[PDB]
């Protein structure tokens, strides 16, 4: 369980993206999750469509609300297309999955990490990236243009992102905003403080598919 875990230089995460004026956090976080695992075994890095997840997942409320843990489940159940055969537009619409044709990616299950346990988060993040939530409605996290976020912030979780590494002290997160935020679309939050919930409630509820 290395002292350092970066999947970027591991060839697991692709360039950064933006959800835009679309409250669709959840589908983006997922595509990165599934994505990671998909490349971890096969040795093939891919960019899947979040747009599809939006238009297809009726359980989620597309362009403004969702469950990073429906998306995944969805995929495993059905599947998910490339981000070319289903590029992101930013507006929820009619499911094209079927109309689009044969799927391209399809997992083999979804599991959740025991909330409120850093030790647990890491491990999984060590075996493969994960979808995690937190407080973004933040007025500080909103302004982050590079650094180690300690706060201030709260325990009112409401935005989903992704963890793509950690250090002895900083946890790495991929944001669904442009590369005109944090440190090039990236933000480092601090771990090991005692805060069980985890600063910004980053330890509330996390997840991930399964792959054979």
């Amino acid at each position: 369980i290395p002292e350092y875990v970066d999947w970027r230089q591991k060839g697991a995460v692709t360039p950064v993206k933006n959800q835009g004026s679309c409250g669709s956090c959840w589908a983006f976080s997922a595509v990165v999750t599934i994505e990671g695992i998909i490349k971890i075994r096969t040795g093939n890095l891919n960019q899947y469509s979040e747009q599809e997840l939006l238009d297809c997942d009726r359980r989620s409320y597309g362009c403004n609300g969702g469950y990073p843990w429906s998306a995944l489940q969805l995929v495993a159940q059905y599947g998910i297309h490339y981000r070319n055969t289903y590029p992101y537009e930013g507006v929820q619409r009619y499911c094209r999955s079927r109309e689009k044709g044969p799927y391209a990616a399809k997992t083999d299950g979804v599991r959740q990490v025991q909330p409120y346990n850093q030790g647990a988060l890491l491990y999984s993040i060590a075996n493969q990236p994960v979808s995690v939530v937190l407080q973004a409605a933040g007025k500080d996290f909103q302004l982050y243009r590079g650094g180690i976020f300690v706060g201030p912030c709260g325990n009112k979780v409401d935005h989903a992102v992704a963890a793509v590494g950690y250090g002895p002290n900083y946890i790495l997160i991929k944001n669904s905003w442009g590369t005109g935020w944090g440190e090039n679309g990236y933000i480092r939050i601090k771990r090991g403080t005692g805060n069980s919930y985890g600063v910004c409630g980053l330890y509330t509820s996390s997840f991930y598919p399964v792959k054979n």
């Binding site: 409250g23 669709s24 956090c25 959840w26 989620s60 409320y61 403004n64 609300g65 969702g66 469950y67 990073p68 939530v133 979780v157 409401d158 935005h159 989903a160």
Partner: peptide
């Protein structure tokens, strides 16, 4: 509630 749903994450936006």
């Amino acid at each position: 509630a749903a994450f936006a």
